[PDB]
């Protein structure tokens, strides 16, 4: 016996916020599969999935399963594992689903030591560029510390820091976090702290 699984869409699903997406799998199997389901968070997927043979004949060994995800929030993301099995073989394929979300700047405040710190979270892993406004900001500033924190809502969190004594401002420092999706820019002004 055998079960060969061919994913019609990327097993690494980068889908944007609040949008629809189909996890489609076409697989050939013999003998006929008598067990097939979509598992999510160690439990059978709560909504519905279509499931049908490619051809309703007898010489048919091709099958298709479709899972309709709708309006993905940071909550309903993760691993969607499609399971198929017959009398001879158990088979599985996993769809790691990420709601692509531009980095949100969780915090942007001044530390007790004096350093400005910007902690931003998103997916994929956001990079933080520090800028300055001598208004539009173009003066690039070198970060003295950058690291990735271990998260607990369903993404990756990075924090970056700069030397705040260096500023003779009289001005504003821009924290710009970004990734493939979008970009967030927060601003810190020393005259109002």
């Amino acid at each position: 016996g055998f079960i060969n699984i061919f994913p019609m869409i990327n097993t690494t699903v980068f889908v944007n916020d609040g949008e629809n997406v189909d996890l489609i799998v076409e697989y050939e199997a013999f003998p006929k599969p008598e067990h097939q389901q979509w598992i999510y968070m160690n439990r059978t997927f709560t909504d519905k999935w279509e499931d049908y043979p490619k051809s309703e004949n007898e010489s048919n060994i091709r099958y298709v399963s479709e899972l309709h995800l709708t309006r993905l929030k940071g909550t309903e993301g993760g691993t969607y594992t499609f399971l198929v099995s017959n009398s001879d073989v158990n088979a599985a394929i996993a769809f790691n689903v990420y709601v692509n979300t531009k980095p949100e700047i969780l915090t942007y405040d001044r530390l007790v030591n004096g350093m400005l710190q910007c902690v931003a979270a998103g997916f994929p892993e956001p990079t933080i560029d520090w800028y300055f406004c001598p208004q539009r900001c173009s003066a690039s500033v070198l970060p003295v510390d950058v690291q990735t924190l271990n998260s607990s809502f369903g993404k990756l969190v990075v924090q970056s820091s700069i030397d705040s004594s260096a500023f003779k401002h009289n001005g504003t420092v821009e924290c710009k976090a970004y990734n493939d999706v979008g970009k967030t820019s927060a601003y810190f002004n020393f005259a109002f702290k």
């Epitope: 061919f6 994913p7 019609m8 869409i9 990327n10 699903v13 980068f14 889908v15 944007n16 949008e19 629809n20 997406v21 189909d22 489609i24 076409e26 279509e50 049908y52 490619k54 309703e56 298709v64 309709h68 709708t70």
Partner: antibody, heavy 118, light 110 residues
């Protein structure tokens, strides 16, 4: 980045000639969505031409364009392609590139004009 | 092969109700789903309804879809100026995949 489909490659060609349409996608990746080509003849309704899963490369065609048309996709460029060969007068239509989800087409490019005549 | 969308051309007014029907022909098909699109002159079609009755994000809730053992139906209650165009129906099936209705123009009476 917002969702956009931009068709191109349309023009005026001779019967039996060839042409290659391209659909640039942005705001989303095509490796996740099925991509379709649907044409609209002038004054007429909509006709489904072709479809592809850019990730697997699995392809599907209309009966009237097989052996002549060839849909493909480059995921590295997030772009779809429609290689139209052996063109006929009745292929004269506005060709739309569309995103496919839940058995339907949720986003449409504004199409490119293709005319086949002598 | 094929799909009959009736009727061809209609006339209504703001606050009115428009009903419009699509029929698949016929049996032997699997997992049939039907979508409804709107199209204005010179523009690309927009998805109104998918999976018979599910409304797509953006289109006002005065757009309704339904189905019976015979009919696929799109109905609009209380028209608006931006509700006047041509409306297409498409179907998807395991066999044949994508088919389209002939499209129907809603207009105005006066």
């Amino acid at each position: 980045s917002e969702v956009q489909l931009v068709e191109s490659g349309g023009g005026l060609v001779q019967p039996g000639g060839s042409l290659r349409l391209s659909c640039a996608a942005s705001g989303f990746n095509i490796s996740v969505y099925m991509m379709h080509w649907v044409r609209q003849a002038p004054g007429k309704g909509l006709e489904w031409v072709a479809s592809i899963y850019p990730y697997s490369g699995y392809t599907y065609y209309a009966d009237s364009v097989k052996g002549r048309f060839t849909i493909s996709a480059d995921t590295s460029k997030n772009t779809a392609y429609l290689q139209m060969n052996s063109l006929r007068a009745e292929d004269t239509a506005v060709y739309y590139c569309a995103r496919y989800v839940y058995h339907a087409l949720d986003y449409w490019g504004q199409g490119t004009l293709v005319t086949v005549s002598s | 092969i094929q799909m009959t969308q009736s009727p061809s051309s209609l006339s209504a007014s703001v606050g009115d109700r428009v009903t419009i029907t699509c029929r698949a022909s016929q049996r032997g098909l699997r997992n049939v789903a039907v979508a409804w699109y709107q199209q204005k002159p010179g523009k690309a079609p927009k998805l109104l309804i998918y999976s018979a009755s599910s409304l797509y994000s953006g289109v006002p809730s005065r757009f309704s879809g339904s189905r019976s053992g015979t009919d696929f139906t799109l109905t609009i209650s209380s028209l608006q100026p931006e509700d006047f165009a041509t409306y297409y129906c498409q179907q998807w099936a395991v066999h044949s995949l994508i088919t389209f209705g002939q499209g129907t123009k809603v207009e105005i009476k006066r």
